[PDB]
Amino acid sequence: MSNFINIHVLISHSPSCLNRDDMNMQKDAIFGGKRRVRISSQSLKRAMRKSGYYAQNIGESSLRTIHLAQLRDVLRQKLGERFDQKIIDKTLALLSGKSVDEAEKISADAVTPWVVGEIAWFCEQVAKAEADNLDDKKLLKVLKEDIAAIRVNLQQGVDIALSGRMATSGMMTELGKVDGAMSIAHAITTHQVDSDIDWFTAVDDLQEHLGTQEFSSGVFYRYANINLAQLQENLGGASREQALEIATHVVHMLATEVPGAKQRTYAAFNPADMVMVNFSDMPLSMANAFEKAVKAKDGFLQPSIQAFNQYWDRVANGYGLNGAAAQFSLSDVDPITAQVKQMPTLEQLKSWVRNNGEA
Amino acid sequence: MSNFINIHVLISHSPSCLNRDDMNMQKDAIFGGKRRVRISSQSLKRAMRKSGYYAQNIGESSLRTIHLAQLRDVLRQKLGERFDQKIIDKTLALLSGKSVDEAEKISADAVTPWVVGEIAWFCEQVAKAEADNLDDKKLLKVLKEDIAAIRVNLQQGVDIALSGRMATSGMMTELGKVDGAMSIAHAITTHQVDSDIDWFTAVDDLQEQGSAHLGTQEFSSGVFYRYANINLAQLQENLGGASREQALEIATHVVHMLATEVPGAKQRTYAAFNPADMVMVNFSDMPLSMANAFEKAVKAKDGFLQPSIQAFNQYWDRVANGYGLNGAAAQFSLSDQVKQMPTLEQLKSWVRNNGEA
Amino acid sequence: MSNFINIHVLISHSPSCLNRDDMNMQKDAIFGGKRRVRISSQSLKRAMRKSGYYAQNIGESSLRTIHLAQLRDVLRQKLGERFDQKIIDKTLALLSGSADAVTPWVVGEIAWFCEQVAKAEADNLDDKKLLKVLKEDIAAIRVNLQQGVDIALSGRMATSGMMTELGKVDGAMSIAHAITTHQVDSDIDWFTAVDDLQEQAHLGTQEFSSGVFYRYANINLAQLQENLGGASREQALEIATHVVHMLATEVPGAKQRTYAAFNPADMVMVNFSDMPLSMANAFEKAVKAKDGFLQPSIQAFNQYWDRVANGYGLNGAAAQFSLSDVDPITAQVKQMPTLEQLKSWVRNNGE
Amino acid sequence: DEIDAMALYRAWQQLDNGSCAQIRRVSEPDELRDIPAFYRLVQPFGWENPRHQQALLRMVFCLSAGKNVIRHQDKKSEQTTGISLGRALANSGRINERRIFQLIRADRTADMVQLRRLLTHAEPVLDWPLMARMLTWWGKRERQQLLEDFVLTTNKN
Amino acid sequence: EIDAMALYRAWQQLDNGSCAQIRRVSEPDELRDIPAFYRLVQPFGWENPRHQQALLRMVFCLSAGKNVIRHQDKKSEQTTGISLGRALANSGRINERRIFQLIRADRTADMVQLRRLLTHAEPVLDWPLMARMLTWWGKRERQQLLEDFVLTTNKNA
RNA sequence: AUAAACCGGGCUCCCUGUCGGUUGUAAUUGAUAAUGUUGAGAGUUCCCCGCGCCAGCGGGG
């Protein structure tokens, strides 16, 4: 069975500014010696994480913070009916490596992802360890013996199972180190973009000074893959089918979710025009299809999709890629040759993915 | 027959940061007076060594460490069924030159490569020596006799056969010196690169951050020229006198990996899983790199990839004619005296068959 | 028919470190007031002498053996005024257990041995004990007599056993330090050592750079012929050919397993002369980069030649082999498509 | 012989809003050559002498960040020169060191673009004729001196 | 190179039928569809492909009329004569935005607009200089046209 | 054939793991491109062939 699942997406956006930096400038990148517009992988990740679809098909997002005071209070309110305050405080203090007073500000080393399910589990363990006069060190060494038992709790924090976590303080260094299952790339345009500039003003209704905003439209190449085995491992040993279902939701989200930036004023609410999913032993990206920046003819979209299809033909024949592959597209013109099953709707695609690429 | 095999790769990466330095800036190098982006040789090496292709087609990889306590416990664990605990401890001690207590902290002199197969073999030898109440320095005397018998074990440690090992303490200092059979160059881009910067933040779900200073991460894309050669004879020697066929086999695996493996750095957040767009293999009596093809840095025209491939091919023609290089050569390319190969597997086969299939 | 052969080479190395000092820092030199990376005379010469090409075409030459039998007559009347024929013939017989010329280091060492034999005759020392005293020296010279061409070209090994003053054998080929045609921007690599058993770091540094190097060498044909027992100019030119090939292909071995700067030279010019001259002043004013360092370096070379060659009296057959098609050099210098053709050209004295 | 910097400065300050607007639209120094208002601006200041063109193109380009983005301030009578560009950029508290890093390593044209972004972002206070000399030469030495001044300032302040 | 004053003198002495027939084109390449053109420009090296594009441009401008472009030799003092932009500015008939939109006008859009300007302005100028400008016609020759126009207009006022 | 000659400073090594730059904003009001002008004249139209009363007529390019 194939371990890696690759998700390729071509999605065209109308004039927008979906990701910018500390100087209100669009994020770009250089590719093939020409400037592409860029949407950072962080942006995509958090857009997916916090989306509504995630909330309805995957669950609650992890709670990412650095303020342990607020976190203390939160954990009390959401767990108080299950544990003594002092078990909670002690668990937080052991995980974080800081002391949980009634101090107003208590800051961790960095912004870390916390999962309330996980913290609860640790609270149980700390409780029985409290009842047994077991010392903190021995508690640690004990817990280190069965890691999977802790990773099961990441089913209430699937995003962490996808993008991972690092720790530099507390027992989390030994316990809460998670290795991301999903690799995801910055989205870049398949063509050159010279951004436009909107010169604006604000009218003062009581009297009778121009600002600027950079923007652009563009056809974007999104890529991500998922390491099934590592996902299963990161979820406590979950099934391949549960893995495939999560991977499916990631396909959906990568084909429909869009960062929120400047959207109320530019509304680039576009859906993907092509989505290909492809099963593989070694993960590969199709970015090179657009190393030679796509030149427009009757748009950027069609030539980008054709460029994609061609590169995939060359790479698949050249490197002998026998893996399940399927392509959904809103365009009619000529797709990838017959080893790529065509999908009329996105849902048929997603079914085909849920079914390990055989349906 | 030719002793050397040359592997050239042109591979193009999308935005990414495949190797960085002490300030977390992309590793670079100056070539032709212009800045290229660099992926170091050690990085490529470790990339291949820890890969899954390696694990499934070559075998186990060396274990590099300095913590003889941890290594102790590991070795006990995977050899306990064949050897006594202090046979194991003894062997470890004699090879490391440090006394193997039941201490929980025992430092070697430096991070060194440990092949488990090798250590098992030395375990058999030390067992023998223990049965005959033999003195250590005499066991050493005996073992210096037949070094090939020890190098035969590097077939379960091919990575050291390829990249070599230097020894500083214990019997290894006498028995362990391996001269690498594979020479491999730092990957550099065939073109000038001005690196981009990503300015990121972290949204704190419990406080609406206002003014903030954004973190930075240098990144870039680029067309890299990878080069490595393998000295077949020295491989054969490092493997205990292995046949040429086995050498060529391993060489073929090195070709594959050099054409497909990409270092792991920041790949979770930049995803540059690109295969190579050109692989050429070239048998020779004297190794020679094609790096000078890009000394005059490639200027872009419809990308950097194709112009690079053509620069490569042209320098290849000029050097082949200029220095009269009639040796088996083959080139695999994705783009529309050198035998052309449609697929990577045909190239690999060609290599396996000493360059005439 | 000039005495000296001059060899000039321009070779470009990709990022590497072909030669460093006691502080593991790349070797240095100031020229024209600006710093150039250097590869030492020593390093390069060793690169050549320990090569396989050298081994097969110098260490396994026909002229490599010196037969003492054929050297009896000439030896004896080159040594007749110092020694009686008895002592001579005894000595030569000891060493070994038609020709009219003899290499001076031979004459010298033979002389020393002779002296010893006479010395031992005066004390009626037993022959067995005599040999027992100078076993070593015998072995030595028996070795050196098997490596004629090698010694003629490169000189004596650093451990040779040569005793005399005529035994201080200079190489027929003189090899200069190689320096870059341009000022160099040196790079610094920062590496670590991952401990596969505690990956939870201590960094080390290695300096490295890329550059266009000017290699220069000369060959003293007369000296070669003399130290081969009076061999012909054709043969000496053969040897010269081999040295040209090597200076164009052989590269020092330092850190090449991890930096692999396995590059062939891009320009090779051979030039006959009465006075051997380096063209290093072509680069006294350091080359500035313009689409690389290679082309401008080559151009600077060519134009230096044009400017000073005849004035400096480099009137003698001259040929140039080069991969880069930059503005050609004076009509009088013959172009060569292949190294092999340049070699053949040298082999036949330059026409 | 030498270019008047202060004159050009004041000229840029008193320019009519339309012309300023027309100049503020270049995205690259050489585009200034596509713009009538530019030639009208630099004509008094020796544009017609080829020696001063590149220089002028840079000056104006940086000024073209805004009508008062570059606040000039005279040096103190005591010290020999006024505030350097690097120092001012550092003094603003809005410029991150890596920006300067990537600035001094940028190719021609690109560096000026980046510089102008930094100037809009910082609104530096500096000795303008000094910066003008710097732009007049703008080579390795000057880029390096920029980063050095930045670093040492940020160090003490 | 191409002899200019020769081509001019040939154009001045062309027969009115050929002359009117040439004027009628609406795009330089349409000259290729006309015999009189070939006979005109053959003595001046049309047969050499290097010179072709150039000639097509030159004649096209000349096609404005037999006496629209008035040549005037440079004064011995001056190093160069009256360039096109100066001539146009001197006409008083051309609006700055015509010139601006001229230099920003695409291959081809460009020559058509220039010819319209020429007929409208009937400029007196050093013809061989114009010819050179037309021989190369790249970004900087266009930008130079705008320069001369703007700067002359400012000078004269 | 010079404090010279002969004459490697040389072997080993991931810089790795975590991170929306985000919220808000008419460029807006005024403005003929306007006055004057035969396209007239003029049978040349370059080649092959047929016929001719050598005035021209016709076939083919």
UniProtKB/Swiss-Prot annotation, chain A:
Sorted UniProt keywords: Antiviral defense, RNA-binding
Annotated Gene Ontology cellular component terms: protein-containing complex
Pfam families: Cas_CT1975 (PF09344)
Top-level division of the source organism's lineage: Bacteria
Reported induction: Repressed by H-NS, activated by LeuO. Activated by the BaeSR two-component regulatory system, possibly due to envelope stress. Part of the casABCDE-ygbT-ygbF operon.
Knocked-out gene: effects: Loss of resistance to bacteriophage lambda infection, loss of plasmid silencing. Increased levels of 57 nucleotide crRNA and also 2 and 3 spacer-repeat units.
GO biological process: CRISPR-cas system; defense response to virus
Disulfide bonding pattern of the chain: none
A GO term, aspect molecular function: RNA binding
Protein name, per record: CRISPR system Cascade subunit CasC
Lineage summary: Bacteria, Pseudomonadati, Pseudomonadota, Gammaproteobacteria, Enterobacterales
Curated annotation (Swiss-Prot), chain D:
Reported phenotype of the disruption mutant: Loss of resistance to bacteriophage lambda infection, loss of plasmid silencing. Increased levels of 57 nucleotide crRNA and also 2 and 3 spacer-repeat units.
InterPro entries named among the record's database cross-references: CRISPR-assoc_prot_Cse2, Cse2_sf
Gene Ontology biological process terms in this record: CRISPR-cas system; defense response to virus
Metal-binding keyword on record: no
Gene3D superfamilies found in the cross-reference section: CRISPR-associated protein Cse2
Coiled-coil regions, chain positions: none
Keyword RNA-binding part of the UniProt annotation: yes
Entry keywords, A to Z: Antiviral defense, RNA-binding
One CC-aspect GO term: protein-containing complex
Single GO term (MF): RNA binding
Induction pattern: Repressed by H-NS, activated by LeuO. Activated by the BaeSR two-component regulatory system, possibly due to envelope stress. Part of the casABCDE-ygbT-ygbF operon.
Quaternary structure annotation from Swiss-Prot or TrEMBL: Homodimer. Part of the Cascade ribonucleoprotein complex, with stoichiometry CasA(1),CasB(2), CasC(6),CasD(1),CasE(1)-crRNA(1). The CasB homodimer forms a cleft that cradles the 3' end of the crRNA. Interacts directly with crRNA, CasA, CasC and CasE. Stable subcomplexes of CasBCDE-crRNA and CasCDE-crRNA also form, both of which are able to bind target dsDNA. Binding of target ssRNA or dsDNA causes a conformational change in the Cascade complex.
Function: CRISPR (clustered regularly interspaced short palindromic repeat), is an adaptive immune system that provides protection against mobile genetic elements (viruses, transposable elements and conjugative plasmids). CRISPR clusters contain sequences complementary to antecedent mobile elements and target invading nucleic acids. CRISPR clusters are transcribed and processed into CRISPR RNA (crRNA).
Similarity comment text for this entry: Belongs to the CRISPR-associated CasB/Cse2 family.
NCBIfam families on file: casB_cse2
Protein name: CRISPR system Cascade subunit CasB
Organism annotation: Escherichia coli (strain K12)
Organism lineage string: Bacteria, Pseudomonadati, Pseudomonadota, Gammaproteobacteria, Enterobacterales
Gene from which the chain derives: casB
Curated annotation (Swiss-Prot), chain E:
Source organism per UniProt: Escherichia coli (strain K12)
Induction section of the entry: Repressed by H-NS, activated by LeuO. Activated by the BaeSR two-component regulatory system, possibly due to envelope stress. Part of the casABCDE-ygbT-ygbF operon.
CC per GO annotation: protein-containing complex
UniProt keyword annotations, A-Z: Antiviral defense, RNA-binding
GO biological processes: CRISPR-cas system; defense response to virus
Disruption phenotype: Loss of resistance to bacteriophage lambda infection, loss of plasmid silencing. Increased levels of 57 nucleotide crRNA and also 2 and 3 spacer-repeat units.
Role played: CRISPR (clustered regularly interspaced short palindromic repeat), is an adaptive immune system that provides protection against mobile genetic elements (viruses, transposable elements and conjugative plasmids). CRISPR clusters contain sequences complementary to antecedent mobile elements and target invading nucleic acids. CRISPR clusters are transcribed and processed into CRISPR RNA (crRNA). A component of Cascade, which participates in CRISPR interference, the third stage of CRISPR immunity. Cascade binds both crRNA and in a sequence-specific manner negatively supercoiled dsDNA target. This leads to the formation of an R-loop in which the crRNA binds the target DNA, displacing the noncomplementary strand. Cas3 is recruited to Cascade, nicks target DNA and then unwinds and cleaves the target, leading to DNA degradation and invader neutralization.
Protein name: CRISPR system Cascade subunit CasB
Classification via InterPro entries: CRISPR-assoc_prot_Cse2 (IPR013382), Cse2_sf (IPR038287)
GO MF, any single term: nucleic acid binding
Lineage: Bacteria, Pseudomonadati, Pseudomonadota, Gammaproteobacteria, Enterobacterales
One matching Pfam family: CRISPR_Cse2
Family listed: Belongs to the CRISPR-associated CasB/Cse2 family.
